[PDB]
Design a protein around this ligand. Structure first.
Ligand SMILES: [Mg+2]
Ligand SMILES: [Mg+2]
Ligand SMILES: [Mg+2]
Ligand SMILES: [Mg+2]
Ligand SMILES: [Mg+2]
Ligand SMILES: [Zn+2]
Ligand SMILES: [Zn+2]
Lengths: 53, 104, 125, 144, 98, 124, 105
RNA sequence: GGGGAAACUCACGAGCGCAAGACAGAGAAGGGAUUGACAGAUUGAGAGCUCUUUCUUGAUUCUUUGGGUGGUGGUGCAUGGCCG
């Protein structure tokens, strides 16, 4: 008998994850792609994000 | 946590048919294709990988398992007189080898 | 020669009025601040109702020997109800339970407002 | 009319992320034959993954093991047994020109206890040989 | 460099045990009458009773399955003093072994 | 001989219905099933040294319209199901003696000629 | 003459490839007789910007990575029959190049 | 430290419950291993959590002796990767 995952992980820091690293801290970049900074920076070239600032 | 017998059966089967099983790192949700309590799918799949009939791979949000040769032997032993004429998809056909040569 | 806010009795009849259904009859509603009214008119819990009755038994059974049975709770979010006056409820803060004698004045106010959640600072170095 | 309409922005970002999903998926499992990349042509009809490797032979698998393992594995996350999601393994013509590959070659030699210098030399020579115009190798770590 | 961890348990909170479900030997719920017919002992749940017996509390009828709870009013005072008497036979014999 | 096909087809079926959830294991289990009239077939271990055991059993069987056969030792039952003290290798030693088996349904992979063998030993 | 106005939409992550489809779709449509083409029109280039603090652990000065993904959308209009289009769409267009079509009369 | 903390996050404090202790050796088990649970009594809490109580359930397991999982726990002076 269990009764966890009771508290409403409905909105905010806990209802978010990084598709990859899975963390919740690093700016979970909502712009459509759930990713923290660190992880995104890694995938940038694979997702398709050039630099040339 | 008890794992229903039919749950067990239903599961080992969904595998033996395909020879492949997939699961997410989530514990509350229900396995996609089978609609089973994941916690149950975890309890069930792990005993396999652990003894050695299952191969595991993990990427982003999912765990990937492909059945082992020694595994079909195990499942068929557990499923009974039903599992004998079973050929996990991943195990036989070889229709037309197709390692593509780049565009014309 | 001292009196009380709006008549401790009018309210017992106001709260336990013809329809003493939801702990806070729409009557008491007219009395509370917007924030409180918000909550009740929104979605108040039932647990808050069984806690209610727990004080009830404490207030009567106890002889006039003014020795109330402390009722323990974590429901620091509860807003004192009229009938909740007189009883001593033990409210958790962080470490233990706090016993507070409910006066007429602490109504409409959050039950948490008395269970000190931290010991402010003394000093020296 | 494909289900839901999506911000060409929103849907494109989704596209990229999916591609980067595939990349972790393949590279992590296809850790035997020279893995390289993926030309993915997605149609509301058929998702076509094209894995490029140094040793395509390894991708197809034995009896057709991996080929089916991967094709099925994908079917498990975004399935469509309708042969929709079909995989193809491309041959990487010049082995020595693919770094993704050479690293694996080096990764292999190092775990087989081949000393560092001797190691790197073989890969570097082999790389230049294949037509490289310049090659470099780095190996940070608790070197002996 | 962070504070250390540790573990000092109160002698008071001590520990707490968990339930230990129990079957007593086998369970012969039936009786053989006229050795040609078979008889019933407990009561049978109405809903799911084609083989399930309800648990007879000291005054309430429980069903291991449907949880249906029943008790007769007039039979409550009668069974309450009958069960409490059988509760004393069990209360005295339990204190004797210790 | 103990009609090889009777005992042989028995264990192939006791293990066939056990590989599927539709099988009943236990005294509590069977007595419960027997009543619900959910047992298309019930077995009883004869060498059962428990008071009124086998009795109360055969008792209900008829009282609820159930076909029934008895097998010599309880031990031979343990095997038909799969209840021994096995070993991560296969090497067994000692086995558990049931006394109450009941099939809720016949697995659909059982032959018409084998089904008749079974009804070829039903009783009280 | 069953004329159908066709809308060719092309959206792409990089300009290299989307310009080839555009350039060739017209090159190919002009050359058919049952064809009427509205010049290849270039919608405004949408840019998705993602600015990120480099380093994982927040130490060292402020370093920011300005990442960009450009999306070029080109639109072409056609005067044809239903077979005519499928005749001109017979290219060999690069990956990640979405092509949507709208048919009206 | 994407550090804008109401909870969550969370690591910290008080109190409470779940095991998701697999896999192996040995002992246990259908004449039951074990889950669940009205009802009062306890709780902060309709947490069987706990006690009294007795009925369900089916070997998914108990038990020890090993031995794992998982861990925002420790060493950035053991290290990759990354960044200043
Ligand atoms: Mg370094
Ligand atoms: Mg701070
Ligand atoms: Mg906490
Ligand atoms: Mg570890
Ligand atoms: Mg970790
Ligand atoms: Zn991440
Ligand atoms: Zn019932």
């Amino acid at each position: 008998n269990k009764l966890w995952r009771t508290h409403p992980r409905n909105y905010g820091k806990d209802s978010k994850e990084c598709r990859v690293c899975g963390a919740r801290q690093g700016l979970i970049t909502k712009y459509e792609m759930m990713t923290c900074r660190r992880c995104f920076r890694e995938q940038a070239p694979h997702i398709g994000f050039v630099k040339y600032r | 946590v008890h794992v229903l017998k039919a749950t067990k059966i239903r599961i080992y089967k969904q595998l033996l048919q395909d020879g492949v099983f997939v699961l997410k790192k989530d514990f509350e949700g229900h396995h996609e294709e089978t609609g089973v309590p994941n916690l149950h799918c975890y309890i069930l799949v792990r005993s396999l990988k652990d003894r050695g009939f299952l191969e595991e791979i993990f990427n982003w949000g999912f765990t990937y398992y492909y059945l082992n040769k020694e595994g079909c032997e195990y499942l068929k032993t557990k499923l009974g007189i039903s599992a004998d004429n079973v050929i996990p998809k991943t195990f036989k056909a070889s229709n037309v080898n197709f390692i593509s040569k780049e565009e014309d | 020669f001292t009196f009380r806010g709006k008549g401790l009795e009018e309210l017992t009849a106001l709260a336990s009025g013809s329809n003493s259904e939801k702990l806070i009859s729409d009557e008491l509603a007219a009395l509370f601040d917007a924030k409180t009214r918000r909550r009740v008119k929104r979605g108040i819990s039932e647990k808050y109702a069984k806690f209610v009755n727990k004080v009830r038994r404490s207030k009567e059974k106890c002889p006039a020997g003014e020795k109330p049975v402390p009722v323990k709770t974590h429901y620091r979010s509860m807003i004192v109800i009229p009938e909740l006056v007189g009883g001593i409820v033990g409210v958790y803060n962080g470490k233990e339970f706090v016993n507070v004698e409910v006066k007429f004045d602490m109504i409409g106010k959050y039950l948490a407002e008395f269970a000190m959640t931290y010991k402010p600072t003394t000093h020296g170095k | 009319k494909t289900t839901r309409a999506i911000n060409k922005k929103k849907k494109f970002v989704a596209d990229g992320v999916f591609n980067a999903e595939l990349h972790s998926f393949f590279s992590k499992s296809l850790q035997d034959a020279g893995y390289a990349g993926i030309e993915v042509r997605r149609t509301p009809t058929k998702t076509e993954i094209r894995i490029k490797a140094t040793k395509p032979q390894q991708v197809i698998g034995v009896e057709g093991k991996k080929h089916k393992e991967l094709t099925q594995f994908l079917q498990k996350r975004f399935g469509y047994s309708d042969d929709q999601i079909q995989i193809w393994a491309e041959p990487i013509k010049f082995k020595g020109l693919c770094a993704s590959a050479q690293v694996e070659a080096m990764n292999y030699k190092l775990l087989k206890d081949v000393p560092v210098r001797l190691a790197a030399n073989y890969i570097i020579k082999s790389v230049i040989q294949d037509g490289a115009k310049g090659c470099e190798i780095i190996i940070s770590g608790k070197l002996k | 460099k962070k504070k250390k961890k540790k573990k000092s348990y109160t002698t008071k909170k001590k520990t707490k045990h968990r339930h230990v479900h129990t079957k007593l030997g086998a369970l012969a719920f039936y009786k053989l009458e006229n050795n040609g017919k078979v008889s019933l002992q407990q009561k049978g749940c109405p809903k799911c009773g084609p083989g399930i017996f309800m648990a007879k509390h000291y005054d309430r009828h429980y069903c291991g399955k449907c949880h249906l709870t029943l008790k007769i009013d007039x039979x409550x005072x009668x069974x309450x003093x009958x069960x409490x008497x059988x509760x004393x036979x069990x209360x005295x014999x339990x204190x004797x072994x210790x | 001989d103990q009609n090889q096909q009777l005992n042989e087809v028995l264990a192939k079926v006791i293990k066939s219905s056990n590989c599927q959830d539709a099988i009943s294991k236990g005294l509590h289990e069977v007595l419960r099933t027997i009543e619900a009239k959910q047992a298309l077939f019930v077995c009883v271990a004869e060498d059962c040294d428990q008071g009124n055991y086998v009795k109360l059993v055969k008792a209900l069987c008829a009282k609820n319209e159930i076909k029934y056969v008895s097998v010599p030792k309880r031990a031979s039952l343990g095997e038909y199901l799969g209840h021994f003290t096995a070993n991560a290798k296969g090497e067994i030693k000692k086995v558990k003696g049931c006394s109450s088996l009941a099939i809720r349904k016949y697995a659909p992979e059982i032959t018409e000629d084998e089904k008749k063998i079974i009804e070829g030993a039903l009783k009280a | 003459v069953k004329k159908v106005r066709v809308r060719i939409t092309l959206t792409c992550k990089n300009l290299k490839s989307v310009e080839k489809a555009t350039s060739e779709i017209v090159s190919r449509a002009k050359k058919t007789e049952q064809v009427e083409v509205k010049g290849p029109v270039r919608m405004p280039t949408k840019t998705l910007v993602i600015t990120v603090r480099k380093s994982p652990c927040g130490e060292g000065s402020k370093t920011w990575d300005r990442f960009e993904m450009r999306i070029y959308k080109r639109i072409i209009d056609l005067t044809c029959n239903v077979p005519d289009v499928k005749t001109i769409t017979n290219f060999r267009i690069d990956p990640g190049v979405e092509i949507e079509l709208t048919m009206t009369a």
